[PDB]
Design an enzyme around this catalytic site. Structure first.
Site, short mmCIF file in Angstrom:
data_model
loop_
_atom_site.label_atom_id
_atom_site.label_comp_id
_atom_site.label_asym_id
_atom_site.label_seq_id
_atom_site.Cartn_x
_atom_site.Cartn_y
_atom_site.Cartn_z
N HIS A 143 52.51 16.45 102.41
CA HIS A 143 51.62 15.86 101.42
C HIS A 143 50.87 16.90 100.62
CE1 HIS A 143 51.54 11.83 103.83
NE2 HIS A 143 52.76 12.16 103.43
N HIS B 288 42.15 19.15 101.82
CA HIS B 288 43.50 18.60 101.65
C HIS B 288 43.90 17.76 102.82
CE1 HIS B 288 45.38 21.50 104.49
NE2 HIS B 288 44.52 22.41 104.01
N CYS B 289 44.91 16.91 102.59
CA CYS B 289 45.58 16.24 103.70
C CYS B 289 46.33 17.28 104.51
CB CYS B 289 46.59 15.22 103.16
SG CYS B 289 47.35 14.34 104.54
N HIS B 290 46.22 17.20 105.85
CA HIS B 290 46.89 18.17 106.72
C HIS B 290 48.29 17.72 107.15
CE1 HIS B 290 47.14 21.83 109.12
NE2 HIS B 290 45.87 22.14 108.91
N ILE B 291 48.85 16.66 106.54
CA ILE B 291 50.31 16.41 106.62
C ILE B 291 50.88 17.41 105.57
CG2 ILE B 291 52.16 14.76 106.16
CD1 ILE B 291 50.07 12.56 107.12
N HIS C 6 46.28 31.26 107.98
CA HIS C 6 44.93 30.62 108.04
C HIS C 6 44.54 30.43 109.50
CE1 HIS C 6 41.64 27.80 107.24
NE2 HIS C 6 42.30 26.76 107.72
N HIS D 219 42.52 28.20 111.50
CA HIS D 219 42.05 26.85 111.24
C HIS D 219 40.79 26.48 111.99
CE1 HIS D 219 42.81 22.41 110.51
NE2 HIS D 219 41.82 22.46 111.37
N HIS E 208 49.91 29.38 105.80
CA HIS E 208 49.30 28.56 104.76
C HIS E 208 49.93 28.90 103.40
CE1 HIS E 208 46.46 25.72 103.11
NE2 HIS E 208 45.65 25.70 104.17
N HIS F 197 38.24 23.35 104.70
CA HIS F 197 38.07 24.74 105.11
C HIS F 197 36.58 25.13 105.04
CE1 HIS F 197 42.42 26.40 104.32
NE2 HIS F 197 42.52 25.08 104.44
N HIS G 102 48.07 29.19 111.57
CA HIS G 102 49.32 28.74 111.00
C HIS G 102 49.56 29.40 109.64
CE1 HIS G 102 47.23 25.71 108.37
NE2 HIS G 102 46.49 25.36 109.43
N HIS H 296 41.25 17.53 105.88
CA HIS H 296 40.66 18.77 106.48
C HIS H 296 39.96 19.54 105.38
CE1 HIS H 296 40.20 22.57 108.54
NE2 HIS H 296 41.13 23.17 107.78
N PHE I 101 48.39 16.88 97.44
CA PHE I 101 47.22 16.11 97.95
C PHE I 101 46.08 17.06 98.37
CE2 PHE I 101 46.55 11.84 100.46
CZ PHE I 101 45.76 11.34 99.47
N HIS J 118 46.15 9.47 106.60
CA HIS J 118 46.06 10.86 106.14
C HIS J 118 44.93 11.58 106.87
CE1 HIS J 118 48.81 9.94 102.87
NE2 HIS J 118 48.06 8.88 102.59
CU CU Z 1 48.68 12.75 103.82
CU CU Z 2 44.93 23.96 109.07
CU CU Z 3 41.64 24.99 107.78
CU CU Z 4 44.31 24.28 105.07
#
Ligand code: CU
Ligand code: CU
Ligand code: CU
Ligand code: CU
Ligand SMILES: *[C@@H]1O[C@H](CO)[C@@H](O[C@@H]2O[C@H](CO)[C@@H](O[C@@H]3O[C@H](CO)[C@@H](O)[C@H](O)[C@@H]3O)[C@H](O)[C@H]2NC(C)=O)[C@H](O)[C@H]1NC(C)=O
Ligand SMILES: *[C@@H]1O[C@H](CO)[C@@H](O[C@@H]2O[C@H](CO)[C@@H](O[C@@H]3O[C@H](CO)[C@@H](O)[C@H](O)[C@@H]3O)[C@H](O)[C@H]2NC(C)=O)[C@H](O)[C@H]1NC(C)=O
Ligand code: NA
Length: 499
Positions: free
Chosen positions: A458, A452-455, A65, A67, A112, A402, A110, A400, A463, A397
């Site tokens: 998670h 989604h949460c980017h941790i 992905h 980002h 994905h 897309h 990164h 993010h 999440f 949290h």
């Molecule tokens: Cu999170």
């Molecule tokens: Cu990302």
């Molecule tokens: Cu993204």
């Molecule tokens: Cu993503």
């Protein structure tokens, strides 16, 4: 050297020791972080990704992905596994061929797939602006002025329990740093500046989890870009940066020639700086080659506060100036229990058929789409508001979206919304108990967009939800190349899956 906008990128396994401890990894371009992919605004990127992975302990499939890049008309190139594509299998390659109209700033790339980016597949992605409105504020902006902040684990990701509080073993700044336990005096990164020059430092969180308190002893930092969005100048002495966020700041090399500590304190893992953990070195040309002797203050008098940020351009806010003042006003119920996260009562588990492929095959409402309850349709050409009230365990949290950036109408730790001039960004901390962080955007980009949460731990624990934006126009807006159509047959054949 930077690579791109047209380049091959090989994904391999190798041993690395960024904190003195050797472990195998998943690498782009043979390094951690991966090489910087770069071009100019509006360029055509064609990143032909060669999957050469063979170690099953970090997964031999992959997907990448880009980002923060909107992918308008190229949803198939966005990268999230089982949302926009099936993974690339080992021994195969795939050309991510897209354009970056109307964007210029600091991004990253990164893996994905699952938690694979934690195992090393992460690097910077910079889209320069030949007519940058901030160009006159600095002298130097190049690969030497990118600063990455990373969490690093001695345990491999596929050995991290799902839904657990997983903690790192080192903070890495530009790929180097020291381990929190069994600390060895392994090499620290050096960022070199010349007395009197001004630098566009491009600060990139490539974290899988922690947020960092970032500062440079003796120096302050003048923010000019937030997640790709040019800002008014805001001078601070500390930046709390959450996973996946980016800032550009001007560093004025205006202190005496010498060595100064660069500090990045994570919210979990090792606290402080003993033994040179959580540290790198700012060295002026002409300084002695030795560690800094500088101190942090006990408290920082001008920390970044998100509501202080404002766009450089007159971006405004779409909709009307009150809660619910949008065509499609949403409130998500964000929860955690028993090792799993949920959104609106549903924990995300990736489907067998990628969401985009389900839509191209004719499924045309969100209740026809899998996973059931994990896909929300958005209407076209409409103002969307999404309230993200915090309280779920494991905070704060960083959420993010897309395909989009968004106005941050309400930020963490402040109950007052801003319908006039908030910052726009793509990843936002939703804060703490009782907060009501709220985002707005307009739907002008048909396709399925992950939220989604980017941790990354998670996300793996569920999440996430998918915004199926303008289902009716998704197929006409996003023509797909044959190589994309080939991915799911090849992946399912290799894994003995029926579909
Ligand atoms: Cu999170
Ligand atoms: Cu990302
Ligand atoms: Cu993204
Ligand atoms: Cu993503
Ligand atoms: C965060 O802000 C959102 C708005 O952006 C707040 O949403 C509002 O939530 C209330 C309930 O908490 C909603 O009112 C309820 O509606 C149902 C009918 O759908 C009714 O049966 C209940 O008796 C009650 O009236 C409301 O529709 C919704 N949207 C608004 C006001 O625009 C949310 O409560 C805020 N969260 C926090 C934690 O501050
Ligand atoms: C909590 O968040 C709110 C909303 O983002 C922040 O409120 C905003 O505070 C700014 C800065 O003081 C106000 O702007 C000021 O307006 C006056 C009048 O035009 C102008 O002379 C000043 O130079 C500055 O532009 C802004 O109006 C205000 N907005 C709202 C909706 O209240 C607030 O500062 C944040 N709290 C903390 C503790 O940071
Ligand atoms: Na407006």
């Amino acid at each position: 050297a930077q690579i791109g906008p047209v380049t091959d990128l090989h994904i391999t396994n190798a041993n690395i020791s960024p904190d003195g401890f050797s472990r195998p990894a998943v690498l782009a371009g043979g390094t951690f972080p991966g090489p910087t992919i770069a071009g100019n605004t509006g360029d055509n990127f064609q990143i032909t990704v060669f999957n050469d992975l063979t170690d099953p302990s970090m997964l031999t499939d992959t997907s990448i992905h880009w980002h923060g890049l909107f992918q308008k008309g190229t949803n198939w190139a966005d990268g999230p596994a089982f949302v926009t594509q099936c993974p690339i299998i080992t021994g195969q390659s795939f050309d991510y061929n897209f354009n970056v109209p109307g964007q210029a700033g600091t991004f990253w790339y990164h893996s994905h797939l699952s938690t694979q980016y934690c195992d090393g597949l992460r690097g910077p992605f910079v889209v320069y602006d030949p007519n940058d409105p901030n160009a006159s504020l600095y002298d130097v902006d190049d690969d030497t002025t990118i600063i990455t902040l990373a969490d690093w684990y001695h345990t491999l990701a596929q050995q991290e329990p799902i839904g657990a509080a997983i903690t790192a073993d080192a903070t890495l700044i530009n790929g180097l740093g020291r381990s929190f336990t069994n600390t060895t005096a392994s090499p620290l990164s050096v960022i070199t500046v010349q007395s009197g020059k001004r630098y566009r430092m491009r600060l990139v969180s490539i974290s899988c989890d922690p947020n960092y308190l970032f500062s440079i002893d003796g120096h302050d930092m003048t923010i000019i870009e937030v997640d790709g969005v040019n800002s008014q100048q805001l001078t601070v002495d500390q930046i709390q940066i959450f996973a996946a966020q980016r800032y550009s700041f001007v560093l004025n090399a205006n202190q005496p020639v010498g060595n100064y500590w660069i500090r990045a304190q994570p919210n979990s893992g090792g606290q402080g700086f003993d033994g040179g953990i959580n540290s790198a070195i700012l060295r002026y040309e002409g300084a002695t080659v030795e560690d800094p002797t500088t101190t942090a203050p006990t408290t920082f008098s001008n920390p970044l506060v998100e509501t202080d940020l404002h766009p450089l351009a007159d971006l405004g806010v779409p909709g009307q100036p009150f809660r619910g003042g949008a065509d499609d006003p949403l409130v998500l119920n964000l929860a955690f229990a028993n090792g799993r996260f949920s959104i609106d009562g549903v924990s995300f588990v990736p489907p067998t058929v990628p969401v985009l492929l389900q839509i191209l095959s004719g499924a045309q409402n969100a209740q026809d789409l899998l996973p059931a309850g994990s896909v929300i349709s958005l209407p076209s050409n409409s103002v969307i508001e999404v309230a993200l009230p915090a309280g779920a365990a494991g905070g704060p949290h960083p959420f993010h979206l897309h395909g989009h950036n968004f106005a941050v109408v309400q930020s963490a730790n402040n109950a007052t919304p801003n319908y006039v001039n908030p910052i726009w960004r793509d990843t936002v901390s939703i804060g703490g108990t009782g907060d009501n962080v709220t985002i707005r955007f307009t739907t002008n980009n048909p396709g399925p967009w992950f939220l989604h949460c980017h941790i990354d731990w998670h996300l793996e624990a569920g999440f996430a939800i998918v915004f199926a934006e303008d289902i009716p126009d998704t197929a006409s807006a996003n023509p797909v190349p044959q190589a994309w159509s080939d991915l799911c047959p090849a992946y399912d054949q290799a894994h003995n899956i029926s579909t």
